[PDB]
Scaffold this active site. Sequence first.
Site, mmCIF file in Angstrom:
data_model
loop_
_atom_site.group_PDB
_atom_site.id
_atom_site.type_symbol
_atom_site.label_atom_id
_atom_site.label_comp_id
_atom_site.label_asym_id
_atom_site.label_seq_id
_atom_site.Cartn_x
_atom_site.Cartn_y
_atom_site.Cartn_z
ATOM 1 C CD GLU A 43 16.654 126.633 58.569
ATOM 2 O OE1 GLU A 43 16.819 125.661 59.545
ATOM 3 O OE2 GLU A 43 16.626 126.282 57.522
ATOM 4 C CD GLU A 57 14.947 119.122 56.304
ATOM 5 O OE1 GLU A 57 14.961 118.423 55.418
ATOM 6 O OE2 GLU A 57 14.370 118.574 57.154
#
EC number: 2.4.2.21
Lengths: 346, 346
Positions: free
Chosen positions: A171, A314
Amino acid sequence: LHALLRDIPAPDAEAMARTQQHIDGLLKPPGSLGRLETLAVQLAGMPGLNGTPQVGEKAVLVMCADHGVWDEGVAVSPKIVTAIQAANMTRGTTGVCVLAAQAGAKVHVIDVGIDAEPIPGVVNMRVARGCGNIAVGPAMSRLQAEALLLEVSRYTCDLAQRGVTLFGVGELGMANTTPAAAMVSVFTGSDAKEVVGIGANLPPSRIDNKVDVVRRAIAINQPNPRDGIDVLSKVGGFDLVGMTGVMLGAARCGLPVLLDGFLSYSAALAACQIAPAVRPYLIPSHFSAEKGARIALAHLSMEPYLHMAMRLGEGSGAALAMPIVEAACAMFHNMGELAASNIVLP
Amino acid sequence: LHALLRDIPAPDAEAMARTQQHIDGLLKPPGSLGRLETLAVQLAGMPGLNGTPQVGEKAVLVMCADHGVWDEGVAVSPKIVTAIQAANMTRGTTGVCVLAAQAGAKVHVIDVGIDAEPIPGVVNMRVARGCGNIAVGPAMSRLQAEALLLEVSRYTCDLAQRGVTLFGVGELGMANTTPAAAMVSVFTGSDAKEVVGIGANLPPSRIDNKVDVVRRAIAINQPNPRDGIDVLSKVGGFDLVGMTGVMLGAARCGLPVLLDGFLSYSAALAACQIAPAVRPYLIPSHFSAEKGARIALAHLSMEPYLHMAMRLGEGSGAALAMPIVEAACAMFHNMGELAASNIVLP
Ligand SMILES: Cc1ccc(O)cc1
Ligand SMILES: Cc1ccc(O)cc1
């Protein structure tokens, strides 16, 4: 969606037995390769893997979105970083990009709700320009959540059709450790103070306010812990929803999903709440340095392989563990056998 | 050898400062990549690395040898497995071979004392046909130990000349967890019972005898904990000696060495005892499932990256962590910078 959930396959016990037996005859003392053996058998039980531990193409899906709760002063990162970094994902300069390239995986950037103009090159599945501020209301509507789940889920399975056999989930969203903590608290019944962390370098002073915001989100929304969709829609976010969707799609496709950090653990709790059948498809990566990590992991009964004190997000941890997965396969397939060397152990 | 020890370089503080600063400007929240950042700076300080985290060629050195203590019934593996497996190392079917190939590393099999006819294809540095039974005497003479140290050390540095920048250390020797435990006990001042493990599936019954053998080895030889060479020669083994030699050579060459498991921790204790300057060159890999692991690691003040419950040996854990090292380099070199994206953090 009921269909979706209905059709998640159970693991193949037969394939797993065959796996175990093969592993046992390899050129080593039985059980000596520990979790590498366990991982291998786990993969063998995955229906989309065709009865053996194997890894074809690899992909890391990065779900990006903004959060209204940002306005509550729970994050020192400027809100625009979400949009900036999203663009960067398209140029291969980010942390997850660098690690994925190292692992031979492809990064798929998905905009599920960035509060900015659309970014060329990014997959567009935007729900809204950022979710609602959970401090004073729900993040979104139940319908919105369901639809995003469906859409991501499908997208995920579709990749499967193109040779992808191993997923990584990640994310990107400024202020996202706040809804993540709220979810964790709710699902694990832990108090806010115990699961609220520094996120992206939040100053020690500011913590208290972050704890209060979480409590408020909960009090105000009253999410139902027995209802994962309810929780996601209320105190979650678009990015959180999309991560859960990846997990649901991979499971339905009978394929493995590598978790990342704290944010990913939250999404995993929701997914397992929504469909316990998802569990056997999840594979931890690393042990996140976020305060609420240990609790979240205990609830998933998971023990990560990597201890790197990472907290970037991420999908960086997921990319980093991919080689481990490939290792288990290499072991399974390329090691010689005891019998072939006339080695006999008690 | 005094020369050798004398010439081990100190780490380059200047290069490390430059490293740190560069890492700090990368596209992430400062310190967010945790141990990956720390690892990178550590490599930058290594003189044979030319002031930056880099990885050229990789090699795993496997030290093979037999032990007289085998006769004390401390190992269920047939003694001949050492020789068998050594041959297997030449065919690429072993656990370390499979993992090294996965990591793009080359395996160097070294016979430092196998009790068998010489094996073609294996590097011959044999001291004797197995070491002395430490239960009733020393493993070898001090001279023998020193000479092996010198020879391995040199061999190691020589590889450096051929482009190798990253070493991995491993072993192969039936009954070797016994001298390993003895060393650990001696160096850490821990009692035998606390560091004696199951080794290669030793039955629970048999443990007591293993503990007694260790105590006896110690009582009889009276090794001096302040003298690492003394300890190695007395209650160590040829394989243990060779592993220490790799560590000494890599350090002298100013290059990094990846540890493996329990056996490797024992050799590392000795190396640091002999030359503390070695320390900064060592890099843990995984957290071995051998009982005495936690103690041995505490004494080296090391926290491994991988939690795989592994206990195979052969340098398998070292090979498995190589990608992590390369990851830290990729991060250092390929990530973009905050300033370039106009991102400004408090
Ligand atoms: C039986 C055996 C096989 C491999 C090894 O490294 C040790 C023992
Ligand atoms: C500032 C920043 C950079 C990257 C990232 O993933 C989050 C925040």
